[PDB]
């Protein structure tokens, strides 16, 4: 932090679907170190993402991510007696991270029975611009467009 | 169905349905459903009428179920109160009878907080 920028860990491709996004997706479903249960859910939510679309599930996921990747998020700061949020431009590698927890994070609190389809019913709707994960990327934008006046506080 | 005045629910297996009698848990139920042939997958919405009749005399010849099983419990409390044991001077006051810590915890025999 305060000295320099910290080094970054690499990633290994998933054997079932060769893609960096897939192991990065299994890694954030993971609670409690139970890793193979987290790959028994992401595989079961991509394989069920072709039973009712028929297309390739990686291509479904590269576009449901592209409907939840933000590019302009907002970031609080205090000046005097009023504290007011300043919009900042988002670097690309942070964008894929906020997008991907917006998939898993809303999928826990849907209304189905098991996590195998709750992640599937959110990858489905975000590929068409429907779900609650897509609701936030515009509220992240609309909160940060309704404050464009404070755009000269880049710290 | 209706085993002994106890109103077995519907759409629930017999492994769990006999547990609703006051006096049958998960172990005595497994030996009611072995001495009378009834398997551990039989739903309650398709019980045969005489198959319940086998089910209601192995219980009423060996076990003790309610009506008098509630009378077993509260009369055994009723004896300890009148003999004057300390454990019956403990049911008089809503305090734990088994030497539990009464300083910080023990809300269950007492009730929730009141902050006087």
């Amino acid at each position: 932090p305060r000295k320099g920028p910290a080094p970054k860990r690499p990633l290994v491709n998933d054997p079932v679907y060769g893609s960096q996004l897939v192991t990065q997706l299994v890694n954030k479903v993971l609670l409690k170190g139970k890793k193979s249960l987290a790959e028994r859910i992401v595989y079961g939510a991509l394989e069920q993402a072709r039973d009712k679309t028929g297309t390739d599930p990686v291509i479904t996921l590269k576009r449901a991510l592209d409907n939840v990747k933000p590019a302009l998020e907002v970031r609080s700061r205090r000046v005097g007696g009023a504290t007011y949020q300043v919009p900042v431009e988002v670097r690309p590698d942070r964008s894929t991270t906020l997008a991907l927890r917006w998939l898993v994070g809303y999928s826990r609190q849907r209304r189905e029975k098991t996590m195998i389809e709750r992640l599937a019913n959110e990858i489905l709707d975000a590929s068409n611009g429907l779900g609650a994960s897509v609701k936030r990327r515009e509220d992240t934008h609309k909160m940060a467009e309704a404050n464009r006046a404070f755009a000269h506080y880049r710290w | 169905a209706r085993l002994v005045g106890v109103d077995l629910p519907r759409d629930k297996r017999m492994e769990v349905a006999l547990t609703y009698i006051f006096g049958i848990g998960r172990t005595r139920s497994n030996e009611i459903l072995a001495a009378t042939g009834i398997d551990r997958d039989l739903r309650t919405r398709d019980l045969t009428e005489e198959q319940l009749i086998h089910l209601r005399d192995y219980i009423e010849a060996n076990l003790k179920v309610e009506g008098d099983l509630r009378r077993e419990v509260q009369a055994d409390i009723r004896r300890k109160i009148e003999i004057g044991c300390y454990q019956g001077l403990r049911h008089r006051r809503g305090m734990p009878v088994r030497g539990q810590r009464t300083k910080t915890n023990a809300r269950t025999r007492k009730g929730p907080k009141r902050t006087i």
Binding site: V12, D14, P15, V16, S36, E39 | -
Partner: protein
């Protein structure tokens, strides 16, 4: 004299025996999908074999002792990667940049007095 090497990851220590052939991993006798039943472990076992370009050949079988199922799997990676140096001392820099020769010195940090894990502190509670 056939070639045998040793790999070790966490506290799992393995002993790989290198036989030329058709690629049949008979680990402790039984096969690769018998007690490595996870596909992600099965990638990192044969991961050095796609750099030496002999993923088909070299039917090996090995000894598995200590550690757990990912340390045992990760130790088998180094044991293959050490074995393809003695049987061909001319693909050294193919596997050097792949990071499979490095033993990856990562063990469990010891538990400390006062603390309740290696680095976890208990509650602070300034009054």
């Amino acid at each position: 004299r056939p070639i045998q090497t040793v790999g070790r990851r966490k506290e799992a220590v393995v002993r790989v025996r290198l036989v030329p052939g058709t690629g049949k991993f008979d680990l402790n006798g039984r096969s690769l999908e018998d007690y490595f039943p996870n596909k992600v472990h099965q990638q990192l076992i044969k991961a050095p074999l796609v750099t030496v370009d002999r993923v088909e050949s070299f039917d090996i079988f090995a000894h598995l002792g200590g550690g757990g199922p990912s340390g045992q799997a990760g130790a088998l990676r180094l044991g293959i990667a050490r074995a393809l140096i003695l049987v061909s001392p001319e693909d050294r820099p193919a596997l050097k940049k792949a990071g499979f020769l490095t033993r990856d010195p990562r063990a469990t940090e010891r538990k400390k007095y006062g603390l309740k894990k290696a680095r976890k502190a208990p509650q602070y509670s300034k009054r």
